Structure formats: structure tokens, C-alpha cells
């Protein structure tokens, strides 16, 4: 067991106060956890709009890396 739990550091609520608290906190939860449906779409990415010198090293370290990083 290595999840970080909610801790009541001070105070001792009754079961009904604990239930009210946890229901409120869960309603205040951040919604869906993360946007797992996010999809890669590199069309018109800003790095493709830059002018690069034909001998520019940023062709390797900026342009190519941005296209290839996954």
C-alpha cells in the first residue's frame, strides 16, 4: 500500500461529518483524470513555419526532434 491518502491531521469528525466531507470533496474532484483522448496532429506546427538556414543546426535539434519525438 503506497498510495497517498487523505489525512485528517486535526479534528475527529463523526461518521456523518466524514460522509458529508467526502461527498463534497468528491463532487469537487477535478473531473476526468487526464485528457487521454488527446491525439497527435502535427499539421501546421509552428516549427515548420520558421525559416532555417540550409546549414542550420536547428534543423537537427529543433525541427527534426519536434517531428520525431513521440
Amino acid at each position: 500500500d503506497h498510495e497517498a491518502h487523505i489525512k485528517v491531521l486535526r479534528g475527529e469528525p463523526t461518521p456523518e461529518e466524514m460522509a458529508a466531507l467526502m461527498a463534497v470533496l468528491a463532487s469537487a474532484g477535478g473531473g476526468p483524470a487526464e485528457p487521454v483522448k488527446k491525439e497527435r496532429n502535427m499539421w501546421g506546427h509552428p516549427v515548420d513555419k520558421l525559416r532555417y538556414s540550409v546549414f542550420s543546426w536547428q534543423r537537427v535539434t529543433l525541427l527534426e526532434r519536434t517531428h520525431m519525438r513521440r
Binding site: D1, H5, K7, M18, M22, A26, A28
Partner: protein
Amino acid sequence: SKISKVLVANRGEIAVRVIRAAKDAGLASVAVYAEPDADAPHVRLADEAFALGGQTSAESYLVFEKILDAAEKSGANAIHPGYGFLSENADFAQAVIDAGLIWIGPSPQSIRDLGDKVTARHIAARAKAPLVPGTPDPVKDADEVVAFAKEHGVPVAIKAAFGGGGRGMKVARTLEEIPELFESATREAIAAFGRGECFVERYLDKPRHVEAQVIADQHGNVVVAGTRDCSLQRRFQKLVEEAPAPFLTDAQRKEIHESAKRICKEAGYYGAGTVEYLVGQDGLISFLEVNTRLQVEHPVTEETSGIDLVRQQFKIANGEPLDITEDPTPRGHSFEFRINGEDAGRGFLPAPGPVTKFVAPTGPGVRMDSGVETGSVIGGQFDSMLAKLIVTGATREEALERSRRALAEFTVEGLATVIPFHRAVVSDPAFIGDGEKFDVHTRWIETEWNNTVEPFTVPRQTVVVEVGGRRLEVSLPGDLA
């Protein structure tokens, strides 16, 4: 040493019934539920409810530690086991007494002594109860069955000494069948009950199942609250019951009422319980078994004799002497119909499904003890019963007329039920006797009723919270955000 809060260690109809009894007595009530029951009527009806977790009886209601944990957490000072489950578990009764709770039931030793059908036979014999010819002790091998069947004549019943639920019997009608039947009896007695002890009795061909409701004091007073007939049985389990038992001579009634008192007193019994008997086709009464708990069909006795049997259980467990001091006079007649989720058109096979509509009958003479309501789901994890319909009248004829009304009103939709069977049988001349006898018997439904019923057509989230270093588990809908 008085009940103040009862944990109803059961579910469904009997849980509702006992919660209601507790509220009438002004006691606090605690329900317990398995996860499939988390919205059952008894959970919402009780003053408190505790989750057991688990999806099946073996994971929940049968776990001694879980029931006693719920008792400790709720602060219940008494446990009522209802019927089935742990109600006849003498080790659970002991565990409750050791936990210092009031066990609302008979003593553990009475439970053991009567749950062994051999010791029960010895008790009955000592009590001079009428007895079927049978082997005094378990038969050692098939040849003792051969000897018994030769001496008494076939048919013979071979029974598990610890059997129950109607499974425990195998019938042999010829001496050549005795062997393999005895082997199968031992085999499944071991498999189902953990013990091979098996004994032999005369099988009765068309017996009528008759039982006496007993109220028994811790101070040794005993009262017979009434008699029931339960001979409409689909396998070896009851479907229709009635009180008082009809068409018995006064000699038979007196023999039943006196044998029940004697046998309970020999057993040292206290609490509610029933002495079951079989009435032979020749009219001879013969002892069958003491049932060491509230009966399912107690309501027909409560309606014909004005006694609240669950409140009598509370008084007895409180140790009060009985206020009833003589057998009450049966005032009317009553029927009970078990509304099982079973398809009578399909061999009475259980049929799980949704209760999409449940409209109980009401009005004169009708009592409904329901465990379900519209929107319930009958899963296969538990007994198929939905409700008990109890119909009372001034005479058996009037109670039949009222049953023909009430069963016609009764509407249940979304799963198969035995209601079409109840409707037929309440109209069947075999059950509407000639006024001095009737033709039903313990195998009438399966062998002789003209069956004409058409066959029926996000998870919880657990959050651990730490509170001053205590672990606490909070369960949430899982979709609150």
C-alpha cells in the same frame, strides 16, 4: 440483559419482518447487506445498515466474523438470525453467546441435538412421539438397507443424518435399487454436508405434511400456537401453506399438540420452533423433525392465532415467562403463497431477472410480506423467493374465495413467478376438498397436478482516509465528480 438493539443477520422478507417487529417493540434495528442487496428494502427500512461486502452468501451473510463485526460496530446487543443462513448454526449461536450478545434463538445444544436427525429420533422416542419404522442408528452398509427393506417392506427412504433443504433423501422401491441408491446417498451426503452418516426409514406413499408451531419458555412453559399444513411441495420444499391444518380428527389434533409439547420439553427447547409431522394416507401421525427457528410460514399462525411470534421470540430471549398460558383457539383460516421467482411452465426452474413491476394485492384479508419492490433485481445468488402473500377468511371456503381474488389482482412483471400455479391450485378441486378430505399430498404438484402454465416469455470507489492515525474506509458512488 434485555434486548435494546437487534442486528437482523439476514436479508429479504424475513429481514423486513424482524425490523418491523423491532420497531413495534420499540427496539433499535440494524440491517446488514451484501453488495447485491445494497438497495434492498430492508436496508432502507432498518434504523442502521452495515455493508458486509462480498457478492455471495458465503462471502457475506455466512461469515461469522463479518456478522459479529457489524454487531460490534453498530453496538447491537442482540442478534436475530431470521431463517436459513446461520439461524440453525450452533457454532454461530455459541459465537454470539461468547461475544456477549443476546442470541434470539434456542440454545446451541438444542440446535445440535435436533439438527442431528439421529439424536432427534432418540429425543422423540424418549418423548414417546409417534415414529416411522426406521433404523435406530445410521446404517453401516447397503446390506443393512436390504435387511430393513426385507423386514418392513419397500418403499424405503434413505436419508442423510445431517441433510437439509429437501436434498437429503433418496427413495428405493425395490430391493434391487437399494445398493446404488445407498452409495449415491453417502456420496452426496459427504459432498453437501461433510458427513456420510445415513439412516433408513419407511417411505410414505402420499403423506400429508403437518406441523405444530411451538412457543417455548426458558422457564419450561410450552404452548402450541397452532397447526399448519404444508403438503403442496414442488420438490421437497413448500409452496402453499395453510392454518389450521384442515381435515384432522380431534384425536389427531390432540396427538400433535401433546407430542409437540413433550418433544420440546425433552429437547429442553426454548424459543419459537416447529414440530413437523407426516400424516400417512392411513391417518397415522409420525414425527419428522423439530425445526429450531422461526418458520417461514409463521404468518398463517399469526393470522389465525392472534400472536406476534417474532415478539414472542424477543420476550423469550429477554427471559420473560410466557404471557400466553394456554393454546389459543384458531379463529379463522389462512393460506400463504410463496411468490418464488420460478417458472411453473418450465419445471419450476429459478429464473433471475428484473422486477420491472410489482403491485401487491390489498384490501380485505390480505397481508403482503414482500422482500422486493419495483426496480429490484433477483440475481441468482440467493433463494428465489420474492414475497409471501397471506390471505385470511372466516372459513377455508372464504379464504379460498379471497385468494382467488387477491391472486388475480397480484401483478408481477419482468420475471417468471409461480403466481399462475397459485391461481390454478386455488381453483383446483384436488385442493378444494369435498369438505371432509382433500387430495393434495407432498408429491401432488410434481406427479398429479395438470400443469397447464405457459412458459414465461460504474463501480463503487473505495477511499482510505487516515484520521489521527486510524485507517478508515469510505465508499463513494464512483461518479460524483
